[PDB]
From a paper:
During contraction, the diffocin sheath undergoes a transition from the alternating conformers B and C to a singular post-contraction conformer. The external diameter of the sheath increases from 19 nm to 22 nm, and the inner diameter increases from 8 nm to 10 nm, which enables the detachment of the sheath from the tube. Four β-strands from three neighboring sheath subunits jointly form the conserved handshake β-sheet. In contrast to the pre-contraction sheath, the post-contraction sheath exhibits evidently subtle motion, as revealed by the three-dimensional variability analysis of post-contraction sheath segments. The helical twist and rise of these segments vary within the ranges of 27.61–28.97° and 25.36–26.72 Å, respectively. This is in line with the increase of entropy from the metastable, higher energy pre-contraction state to the lowest energy post-contraction state. The shape of the diffocin in the pre-contraction state mirrors a syringe, and its typical length is about 146 nm. During contraction, the sheath layers of the trunk are compressed by about 47 nm.
Numbering used by the authors:
A (entry chain B): 2 to 354
B (entry chain J): 305 to 354
C (entry chain K): 254 to 304
D (entry chain C), E (entry chain N): 204 to 253
């Protein structure tokens, strides 16, 4: 309709955008006390609630010291004594995190936490990890650090109490580098123990602290799983590889659910656009040197053919290209190949005169 | 259309398919069509091998 | 051994370019030692293909 | 919107508010542009000259 | 940081502390530069002149 003359000038900003990916470097911390119960949200190193016990403050201080840099965010939840673990566990399932730790826990608590982690990593499709004092849990979700009588600052520490420092050390490092052979200037002595014993413990999936060169260092941080199926390969035993896999999973899932779920029609061209977006994300990750340069993503073919045959359609004469043409009805099948890099660990040099 | 023509008693044994389609129907129209309806993506299955 | 353990262990990703950089560093150290007249002038370092 | 022609006070002085014609209903024959004074005037002069 | 303009005693005399605007939320089109008095002022003058 004809209205009054319109003169409008609009001002907008060039919204230069880098996509917000899943946060990494957050630590889930749980502790039991009668003061300041619940989460405490220690985002900053300096600020600490005062009603907490001094010893627990020491535990926080061990938690804060990062490996290369300070942990991005620290979440400490205070629980009432004897309230069991589930009461805290639901609270933690409410929010996101990366690593969980318990200074004070009986073996029943460790069993409960390990069962929770295994069920959560496979049922709820959420990738989290936790460090435990002494467990033989055979999953990728737990790291078993085991060293007795650790002396930090003239004070003795058991393994369970030191797990906080181990978790902070793990979360401090960037994804580019690894944890193996990292100096811990805080610790000043460990009970003496031989090299072949270290070989035996490391081959068990156990994480051990070693005295080598001038300082005190972690000896080849590895996972806890020991049996190697045809499904779970050797590389699943390294912390760095499983961590970058978790990050990849979280980012891909977040993108998929946030944009392409229930908003775009299931057609071949939309599949191509989704593949292009996935490949763009993979190339962006490759730029940061976490995976190899060349990777490929392609629509899964055999699963699609099996799905069509399960529906009774006759696919005898249609060509492979026509097979990929076929409608699937709100189902998408894709496969992708990547190669994960690792940090230098063993160097073999041969010099002849 | 063939069934309707049979119902009125016309003898269509010899008449060929195009001639059957040609026959008058008297204000009756019979049509059939086929389509395929798209849907939004709902379930995504991604398989990655290292 | 001291250089390798201090700088290149658990801090550099295993890639072709990183290996080339390590080779360059090793060759630089060898040349520096050659300046002190302990080895002959020309020395070569390269990736061990057979192993 | 009624086809009414009005006078509006805006900016410094008094100004005419988008001089339009009087017709309001738009047929398939009489399009939108027949509502502007300038267009109908140039159509009239074209008609008279030809 | 709360979008408030404050008076600060520092150096020899009393001076303004980074004169900023009252808006605090940042949207997609309202970027960072929309928080400065000088920038919004020159934008306003451009709008009026044009």
């Amino acid at each position: 309709a004809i209205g009054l003359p319109s003169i409008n000038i609009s001002f907008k900003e060039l919204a230069t955008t880098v996509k917000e990916r899943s946060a990494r470097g957050i630590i889930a911390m749980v502790l039991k006390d009668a003061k300041a119960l619940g989460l405490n949200e220690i985002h900053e190193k300096e600020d600490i609630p005062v009603d907490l016990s001094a010893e627990n403050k020491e535990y926080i201080n061990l938690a804060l010291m990062g490996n290369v840099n300070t942990p991005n965010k620290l979440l400490v939840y205070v629980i009432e004594g004897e309230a069991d673990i589930q009461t805290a566990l639901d609270f933690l399932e409410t929010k996101e995190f990366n690593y969980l730790c318990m200074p004070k826990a009986v073996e029943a608590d460790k069993t409960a936490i390990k069962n929770w982690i295994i069920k959560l990593r496979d049922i709820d499709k959420v990738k989290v990890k936790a460090v435990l004092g002494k467990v033989v849990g055979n999953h990728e979700g737990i790291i078993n650090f085991t060293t007795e009588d650790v002396l930090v600052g003239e004070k003795k520490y058991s393994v369970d109490e030191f797990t906080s420092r181990v978790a902070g050390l793990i979360a401090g490092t960037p994804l580019s580098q690894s944890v193996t052979y990292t100096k811990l200037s805080d610790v000043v002595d460990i009970p003496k123990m031989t090299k072949v014993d270290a070989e035996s413990r490391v081959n068990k999936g156990e994480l051990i602290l070693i005295k080598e060169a001038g300082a005190i260092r972690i000896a080849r941080g590895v996972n806890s799983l020991t049996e190697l199926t045809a499904e779970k390969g050797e590389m699943f035993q390294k912390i760095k590889i499983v961590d970058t896999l978790d990050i990849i999973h979280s980012d891909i899932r977040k993108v998929i659910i946030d944009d392409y779920i229930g908003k775009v029609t299931n057609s071949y061209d939309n599949k191509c656009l989704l593949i292009v977006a996935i490949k763009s994300y993979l190339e962006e990750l490759e730029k940061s040197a976490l995976i190899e340069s060349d990777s490929t993503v392609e629509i899964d073919f055999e699963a699609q053919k099996s799905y069509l045959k399960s529906k009774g359609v006759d696919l005898s004469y249609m060509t492979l290209q026509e097979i990929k043409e076929a409608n699937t009805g709100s189902k998408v099948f894709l496969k992708a190949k990547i190669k994960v890099l690792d940090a230098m660990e063993d160097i073999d040099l041969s010099i002849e005169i």
